[PDB]
RNA sequence: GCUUUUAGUGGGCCAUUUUUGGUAAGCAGAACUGGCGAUGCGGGAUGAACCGAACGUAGAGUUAAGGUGCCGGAAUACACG
RNA sequence: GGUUGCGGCCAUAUCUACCAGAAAGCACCGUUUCCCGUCCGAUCAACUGUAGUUAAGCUGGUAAGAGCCUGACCGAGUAGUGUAGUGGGUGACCAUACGCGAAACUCAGGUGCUGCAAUCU
C-alpha cells in the first residue's frame, strides 16, 4: 500500500549536511526574531521537536508570534486555485533570517541618503534601480595585441 | 562613420555601441503555444500574427 | 530456452544490478577478463589496440564470452600464447529480467534472466596490448570479435603505451628519466608532491642527473 | 472494467481559468493564536493610550 | 548554404579588472551574411577557448574580397566533416576563380558525394596551390596540360516553342 | 519618432501610447521555404538584425 | 476587488519530451505542456489528434504549411554533383 | 606580541613525526585533617604555593607530509541540459540553432582568524 506519513520522502532533506553533523552552533539560539521579520525555513535534522512539514522547507514567510523556544511563521500555500495562509509554530533551530530583506533595508538607507544629498546639491536625484544596460562604443587597440588567426582543428582520436 | 575611419587609421577597431532598441514581429499564429512564451507575448503586446512593437533593450527584455 | 539478444539490445530499463534486493541472479557466462601474457611488464607491449563501441546498447555476458573465446583463439593460434595481453574492459553488472509465462499481465514483474554490460558510445570493450610487429594479427583478432557483438564497433589504435594513459613519446620521456618504476603488470610514477624522504626510497634511479 | 486511476491533466489549466488568487493581506492582521500573555497586556496598552489621547482633548 | 561571402571576424572575451585588453582572436568565416558569420565565429571559438557569446564581444566584422577575382587558381581545401557513423578529415582540390567560389562548390560537392550538409562541415583551411605538380588530385591535373582544347559534343538547343517544325539538330 | 529611435527618458510612455502595428504579410514573400527555424539556419525567427528593415518595409 | 446562486461534468484519448511494467503491441500505468473530444479551413491522396492556421457576411492584395511534367492552380526554371 | 577566563565562525583550526619556548599565566606537581567520592585521594573532593619542573600538556616552528580551504582561458565551454526544426539515421541514437553549464582531473597559493575582560619584560 501507499505511504504518506508526516516524514515520507525525506531521506535527503532532513539529512545533516556531510561533515557538519552533531550539535548546532550557538548563534542559532542568539538571533532575535521580531514580529514582522522575514525568515527562511530550513529544518535542522537533529532537532526532532518543532520541525516543519517537508512542504515548508525552503519556504520564506513572516514572523507573527514570538514565544519561548519557537516563533510563529506565516506561509502562503498554493492549494487549488487559491492561496491559503498557514501558521507554523517552529523552533528556532529550523529557521534563519532572510538576507534578501538585507538587500532592502540597506538599500533603503542608501536611497534615503542619496535623496537628501541631491536635495542640497542639485535635485534630479535619479535614485531608482536600472537593469543591465547595453554596452557603450569603445576603441580597442591592436598595439601589442595583433590578432591571432585561429582555424578549426582536424579530427584526431587520442585514446 | 568618422570614429570607424579614425580608428582604422590609428591602428585600432571602433566597436559600435550596442543597439538600444529592437523591433519585434510576431511570426507564429495563436495555436499550440506553451504558457511561458504565450504569457511573454501577451506582455509584449503581440497578440496576433504579423504584429510588431518596439522594445527597449535591457537584460530584462 | 534463452531469448534472442534483440529483446535486450537497448538500454530501455534503469540499471538493475545484483543487490540485496535482487539476490536471485544467475552467474555471468564470462568469468575471466585478462588473457594472454598478463604477467608482462609495461615496456614489453608498447602498442595497444582497442575495440571501441559506437552504439549505446547492452552486450550480453554470453556475447562477451564468445567474443573473448574467438579473439583469444585466433591470437594464440597465429602469434602464440604470450605475445599479447587481452583485457575485457566491460563487466556485465546489469541484470536482465523475463516474464516467463491463466493470468496475463497481472503480476508481470519478471524473474532474472541473464546479465549484460551496459555500454555507451565510445566505450572500449576489449583492449589488447602487444608488440608493434604483432600489430595486424591483433587487428584480425579484434575483427573476428566484431561478429559476436550486436551493433557497430570499430577497432582503433591507441596513441598510448599499452594500458597506461601517457603517450608513447611521453612514456619514453618518463622511462629515460627516472620517474617510471616497475610493478607487476603496471607501472608507478614519480610525483613532485609527497614526502621527499620516502620519495627517494622509491625511485633511486632519479635524483642524480640523467638516465 | 478497469479504468484510469489518477491524472493531474488539465488541473493547472483549470486553476488558471479563475487566475489563482493571493490571500489579500490586511493592515492590522488578526491576533488569533498570538501568545496570550502578550495579547492580554496589549488590551491594556491600547486602552491606556486611548484614555491618554482622549485626555489630550479634555 | 548560399552564394558565400568571406568575413573576417575579430572577437575577444570581455575585459575584467585582472585582464584588460584581452587577446583578440580572429577567424575567416564563409557565410551568407554578417548575421550567420558572427554565429559561426562563436561556434568555432567555443570549440577552441573558454568563451561564449555572453562572455565575449565581437570587435570587428569585415568582408574580404578576392585580391584578383579574375585569375584562375587551384585551391587545395582541407575539410573536417561528419558522416553518419564517424568524423573524418578530407583533402579535396578545387580549381576556380575565388576563395568564395571554391567554397561554394565545396559544399555542393560534399553534399553530393558524401551527403554532408552545412551543419556537418568544418572547413579547416582553404589554400591556393601556386605551382603545378603540387596538384595532388587528377580531376584538376586534367586542366593543367599544355594547350587544352576539347569539344562539347551533342549540343541540345532549348526551344521557345512547344512544337518544332524541322527536326532538332545536335551539331556543334 | 525621436522618442523611439534615440530611446528617450519617456520611451515607455511614448511606446505604450502607440497601438501595436498590425503589419501585413511581406510583399516579396518571406524569402525562405520554411519559416520556423532560426534566421541562422535559413528560416525566419530570431535576430535578423539589420535585415529586420527588409522584413518590415515589405510588411508595412 | 468582492458576493450570491445554479447548470452540465465526475467513462476520456492522442502528440513531443521525461518515465515505470512488459520481448513487444494501435499494450497497461504516471509527469509537464499542447491538442482532439467540442473544430470547421489550407496541406499530409485518403485519416479525430500531425504541419499551417482557428471561422460574422463579402471584395481586393499578400502569404503559411505544402507545392510548380500531366491529372492540378503554379519554372519540362537555373547551378554543382 | 605572549598568556589566562569566557567565547564567535567550527580542520586555513584536523592528524602523524621531530625542534623551540625569556617573562607572566596555564599546567604538571606536594599533602589527606575537614566537606566529598572511590576496590584504589588514579578520576573526583579538600589543603598549601609550600618540596620541584618545563619532561609532558599548552603555544609556535619544521615536513617536495596526509587531510582540509581558496583560486584558475587546468580539464572544459566538455558532459549534462531548456527551447527549435516536414534536421540526419531502418533504428540505437547523433549533429545543428538560440541558451544555461558541472564534477573528477591538473596546477598554484594557504595551514586559523577574531570579540570581551584580565595579566606579563
Swiss-Prot record, chain A:
The yes or no answer to whether the keyword Ubl conjugation is present is yes
Cell compartment(s), UniProt: Cytoplasm
Q: Name one GO cellular component term.
A: cytosol
A Pfam family this chain is assigned to: Ribosomal_L21e
Q: Name one GO molecular function term.
A: structural constituent of ribosome
Q: List the disulfide bonds.
A: none
Where is it predominantly found? cytoplasm
Q: Enter cross-link residues for Glycyl lysine isopeptide (Lys-Gly) (interchain with G-Cter in ubiquitin).
A: 31
What's one GO BP annotation on this UniProt entry?
Answer: cytoplasmic translation
What else the UniProt entry mentions is:
There are 2 genes for eL21 in yeast.
Q: Which family does it belong to?
A: Belongs to the eukaryotic ribosomal protein eL21 family.
Question: How does the record describe its quaternary structure?
Answer: Component of the large ribosomal subunit (LSU). Mature yeast ribosomes consist of a small (40S) and a large (60S) subunit. The 40S small subunit contains 1 molecule of ribosomal RNA (18S rRNA) and 33 different proteins (encoded by 57 genes). The large 60S subunit contains 3 rRNA molecules (25S, 5.8S and 5S rRNA) and 46 different proteins (encoded by 81 genes).
PANTHER family in the cross-refs: 60S RIBOSOMAL PROTEIN L21
What is this protein's function per UniProt?
Component of the ribosome, a large ribonucleoprotein complex responsible for the synthesis of proteins in the cell. The small ribosomal subunit (SSU) binds messenger RNAs (mRNAs) and translates the encoded message by selecting cognate aminoacyl-transfer RNA (tRNA) molecules. The large subunit (LSU) contains the ribosomal catalytic site termed the peptidyl transferase center (PTC), which catalyzes the formation of peptide bonds, thereby polymerizing the amino acids delivered by tRNAs into a polypeptide chain.
Q: What is the protein name for this chain?
A: Large ribosomal subunit protein eL21A
From Swiss-Prot, chain B:
Give the record's keywords alphabetically: Cytoplasm, Ribonucleoprotein, Ribosomal protein
Cellular component per GO? cytoplasm; cytosol; cytosolic large ribosomal subunit
Top-level lineage group:
Eukaryota
The reply on keyword Nucleotidyltransferase is no
Location(s) in or outside the cell: Cytoplasm
Principal place of residence: cytoplasm
GO terms for MF = RNA binding; structural constituent of ribosome
Q: Which GO terms fall under biological process for this protein?
A: cytoplasmic translation; maturation of LSU-rRNA; maturation of LSU-rRNA from tricistronic rRNA transcript (SSU-rRNA, 5.8S rRNA, LSU-rRNA); ribosomal large subunit biogenesis
Q: What does this protein do?
A: Component of the ribosome, a large ribonucleoprotein complex responsible for the synthesis of proteins in the cell. The small ribosomal subunit (SSU) binds messenger RNAs (mRNAs) and translates the encoded message by selecting cognate aminoacyl-transfer RNA (tRNA) molecules. The large subunit (LSU) contains the ribosomal catalytic site termed the peptidyl transferase center (PTC), which catalyzes the formation of peptide bonds, thereby polymerizing the amino acids delivered by tRNAs into a polypeptide chain.
Q: What family is this protein classified in?
A: Belongs to the universal ribosomal protein uL30 family.
Q: What other note does the entry give for this protein? A: Present with 101000 molecules/cell in log phase SD medium.
The name of this protein is Large ribosomal subunit protein uL30A
Organism taxonomic ancestry: Eukaryota, Fungi, Dikarya, Ascomycota, Saccharomycotina
UniProtKB/Swiss-Prot annotation, chain C:
The cross-link described as Glycyl lysine isopeptide (Lys-Gly) (interchain with G-Cter in ubiquitin) comes at 39, 100
Residues modified to Phosphoserine: 133, 195
Where is the major localization of this protein?
Answer: cytoplasm
A Pfam family annotated for this chain is Ribosomal_L16
CDD domains xref list: Ribosomal_L16_L10e (cd01433)
Where is this protein found? Cytoplasm
| Xref: Gene3D superfamilies | 3.30.60.300, Ribosomal protein L10e/L16
Q: Which PROSITE patterns match?
A: RIBOSOMAL_L10E
Q: Which domain of life is it from?
A: Eukaryota
| Keywords annotated in UniProt | Cytoplasm, Isopeptide bond, Phosphoprotein, Repeat, Ribonucleoprotein, Ribosomal protein, Ubl conjugation
Gene Ontology cellular-component terms listed? cytoplasm; cytosol; cytosolic large ribosomal subunit
> Which residue intervals correspond to the sequence repeats?
157-171, 190-206
- A GO molecular function held by the record: structural constituent of ribosome
GO process annotations (BP): cytoplasmic translation; ribosomal large subunit assembly; translation; translational termination
Q: Where is this region: 2 X 15-17 AA approximate repeats?
A: 157-206
Annotated family? Belongs to the universal ribosomal protein uL16 family.
**The protein's assembly and partners:** Component of the large ribosomal subunit (LSU). Mature yeast ribosomes consist of a small (40S) and a large (60S) subunit. The 40S small subunit contains 1 molecule of ribosomal RNA (18S rRNA) and 33 different proteins (encoded by 57 genes). The large 60S subunit contains 3 rRNA molecules (25S, 5.8S and 5S rRNA) and 46 different proteins (encoded by 81 genes).
Provide the protein name: Large ribosomal subunit protein uL16
Curated annotation (Swiss-Prot), chain D:
Q: Composition bias, kind Basic residues: at what positions? A: 1-25
Q: What is its main location?
A: cytoplasm
Q: Does the keyword Cell inner membrane apply?
A: no
Q: Where does the source fall among the domains of life?
A: Eukaryota
Q: Where is this cross-link: Glycyl lysine isopeptide (Lys-Gly) (interchain with G-Cter in ubiquitin)?
A: 51
> One of this protein's GO BP terms?
cytoplasmic translation
Q: Which GO terms describe its cellular component?
A: cytoplasm; cytosol; cytosolic large ribosomal subunit
Compartments reported by the entry: Cytoplasm
- Keywords, comma-separated and alphabetical: Cytoplasm, Isopeptide bond, Ribonucleoprotein, Ribosomal protein, Ubl conjugation
Region listing for Disordered, in residue ranges: 1-36
Q: Which Pfam families match?
A: Ribosomal_L29e
Q: Which residues form a coiled coil?
A: none
Which molecular-function annotations from GO does this UniProt entry contain?
structural constituent of ribosome
- Does Ubl conjugation count among this protein's keywords? yes
Subunit text: Component of the large ribosomal subunit (LSU). Mature yeast ribosomes consist of a small (40S) and a large (60S) subunit. The 40S small subunit contains 1 molecule of ribosomal RNA (18S rRNA) and 33 different proteins (encoded by 57 genes). The large 60S subunit contains 3 rRNA molecules (25S, 5.8S and 5S rRNA) and 46 different proteins (encoded by 81 genes).
The miscellaneous comment for this protein is: Present with 51100 molecules/cell in log phase SD medium.
Q: What role does it play?
A: Component of the ribosome, a large ribonucleoprotein complex responsible for the synthesis of proteins in the cell. The small ribosomal subunit (SSU) binds messenger RNAs (mRNAs) and translates the encoded message by selecting cognate aminoacyl-transfer RNA (tRNA) molecules. The large subunit (LSU) contains the ribosomal catalytic site termed the peptidyl transferase center (PTC), which catalyzes the formation of peptide bonds, thereby polymerizing the amino acids delivered by tRNAs into a polypeptide chain.
UniProt similarity note: Belongs to the eukaryotic ribosomal protein eL29 family.
Amino acid at each position: 500500500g501507499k505511504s504518506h506519513g508526516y516524514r515520507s520522502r525525506t531521506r535527503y532533506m532532513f539529512q545533516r549536511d556531510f561533515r557538519k553533523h552533531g550539535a548546532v552552533h550557538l548563534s542559532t539560539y542568539l538571533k532575535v526574531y521580531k514580529v514582522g521579520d522575514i525568515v527562511d525555513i530550513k529544518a535542522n535534522g537533529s532537532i526532532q521537536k518543532g520541525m516543519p512539514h517537508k512542504f515548508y522547507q525552503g519556504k520564506t514567510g513572516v514572523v507573527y508570534n514570538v514565544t519561548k523556544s519557537s516563533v510563529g511563521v506565516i506561509i502562503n500555500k498554493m492549494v487549488g486555485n487559491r492561496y491559503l495562509e498557514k501558521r507554523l509554530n517552529l523552533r528556532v533551530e529550523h529557521i534563519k533570517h532572510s538576507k534578501c530583506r538585507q538587500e532592502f533595508l540597506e538599500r533603503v538607507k542608501a536611497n534615503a541618503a542619496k535623496r537628501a544629498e541631491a536635495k542640497a546639491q542639485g535635485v534630479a536625484v535619479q535614485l531608482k534601480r536600472q537593469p543591465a544596460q547595453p554596452r557603450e562604443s569603445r576603441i580597442v587597440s591592436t598595439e601589442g595585441n595583433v590578432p591571432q588567426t585561429l582555424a578549426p582543428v582536424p579530427y584526431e582520436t587520442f585514446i | 562613420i568618422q570614429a570607424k575611419r579614425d580608428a582604422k587609421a590609428a591602428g585600432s577597431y571602433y566597436v559600435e555601441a550596442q543597439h538600444k532598441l529592437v523591433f519585434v514581429v510576431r511570426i507564429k499564429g495563436i495555436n499550440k503555444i506553451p504558457p511561458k512564451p504565450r504569457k511573454v507575448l501577451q506582455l509584449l503586446r503581440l497578440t496576433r500574427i504579423n504584429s510588431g512593437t518596439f522594445v527597449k533593450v535591457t537584460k530584462a527584455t | 530456452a534463452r531469448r534472442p539478444a534483440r529483446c535486450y539490445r537497448y538500454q530501455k530499463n534503469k540499471p538493475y544490478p545484483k543487490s540485496r534486493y535482487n539476490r536471485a541472479v544467475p552467474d555471468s557466462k564470462i568469468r575471466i577478463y585478462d588473457l594472454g601474457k598478463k604477467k608482462a611488464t609495461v615496456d614489453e607491449f608498447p602498442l595497444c589496440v582497442h575495440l571501441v563501441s559506437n552504439e549505446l546498447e547492452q552486450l550480453s555476458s554470453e556475447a562477451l564470452e564468445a567474443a573473448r573465446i574467438c579473439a583469444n583463439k585466433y591470437m594464440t593460434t597465429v602469434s602464440g600464447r604470450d605475445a599479447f595481453h587481452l583485457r575485457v574492459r566491460v563487466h556485465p553488472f546489469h541484470v536482465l529480467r523475463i516474464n516467463k509465462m491463466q493470468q496475463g499481465m497481472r503480476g508481470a514483474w519478471g524473474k532474472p534472466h541473464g546479465l549484460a554490460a551496459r555500454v555507451d558510445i565510445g566505450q572500449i570493450i576489449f583492449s589488447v596490448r602487444t608488440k608493434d610487429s604483432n600489430k595486424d594479427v591483433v587487428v584480425e583478432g579484434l575483427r573476428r570479435a566484431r561478429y559476436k557483438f550486436p551493433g557497430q564497433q570499430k577497432i582503433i589504435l591507441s596513441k598510448k603505451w599499452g594500458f597506461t594513459n601517457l603517450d608513447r613519446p611521453e612514456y619514453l620521456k618518463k622511462r629515460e628519466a627516472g620517474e617510471v618504476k616497475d610493478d607487476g603488470a603496471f607501472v608507478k610514477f614519480l610525483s613532485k608532491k609527497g614526502s621527499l624522504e620516502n620519495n627517494i626510497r622509491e625511485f633511486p634511479e632519479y635524483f642524480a642527473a640523467q638516465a | 472494467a478497469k479504468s484510469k486511476n489518477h491524472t493531474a491533466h488539465n488541473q493547472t489549466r483549470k486553476a488558471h481559468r479563475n487566475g489563482i488568487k493571493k490571500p489579500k493581506t490586511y493592515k492590522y492582521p488578526s491576533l488569533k493564536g498570538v501568545d496570550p500573555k502578550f495579547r492580554r497586556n496589549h488590551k491594556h496598552a491600547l486602552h491606556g493610550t486611548a484614555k491618554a489621547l482622549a485626555a489630550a482633548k479634555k | 548554404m548560399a552564394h558565400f561571402k568571406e568575413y573576417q571576424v575579430i572577437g575577444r572575451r570581455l575585459p575584467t579588472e585582472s585582464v584588460p585588453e584581452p587577446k583578440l582572436f580572429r577567424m575567416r568565416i564563409f557565410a551568407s551574411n554578417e548575421v550567420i558569420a558572427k554565429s559561426r565565429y562563436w561556434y568555432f571559438l567555443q570549440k577552441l577557448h573558454k568563451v561564449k557569446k555572453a562572455s565575449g564581444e565581437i570587435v570587428s566584422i569585415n568582408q574580404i574580397n578576392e585580391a584578383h577575382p579574375t585569375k584562375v587558381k587551384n585551391f587545395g581545401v582541407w575539410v573536417r566533416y561528419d558522416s553518419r557513423s564517424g568524423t573524418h578529415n578530407m583533402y579535396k582540390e578545387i580549381r576556380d576563380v575565388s576563395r568564395v567560389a571554391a567554397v561554394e562548390t565545396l559544399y555542393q560537392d560534399m553534399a553530393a558525394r558524401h551527403r554532408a550538409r552545412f551543419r556537418s562541415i568544418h572547413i579547416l583551411k582553404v589554400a591556393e596551390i601556386e605551382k603545378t605538380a603540387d596538384v595532388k588530385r587528377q580531376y584538376v591535373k586534367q586542366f593543367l596540360t599544355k594547350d587544352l582544347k576539347f569539344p562539347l559534343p551533342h549540343r541540345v538547343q532549348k526551344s521557345t516553342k512547344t512544337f518544332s517544325y524541322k527536326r532538332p539538330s545536335t551539331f556543334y | 519618432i525621436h522618442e523611439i529611435i534615440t530611446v528617450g527618458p519617456h520611451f515607455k510612455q511614448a511606446n505604450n501610447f502607440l497601438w501595436p502595428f498590425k503589419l501585413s504579410n511581406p510583399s516579396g514573400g518571406w524569402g525562405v521555404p520554411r519559416k520556423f527555424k532560426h534566421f541562422i539556419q535559413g528560416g525566419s525567427f530570431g535576430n535578423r538584425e539589420e535585415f529586420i528593415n527588409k522584413l518590415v518595409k515589405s510588411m508595412n
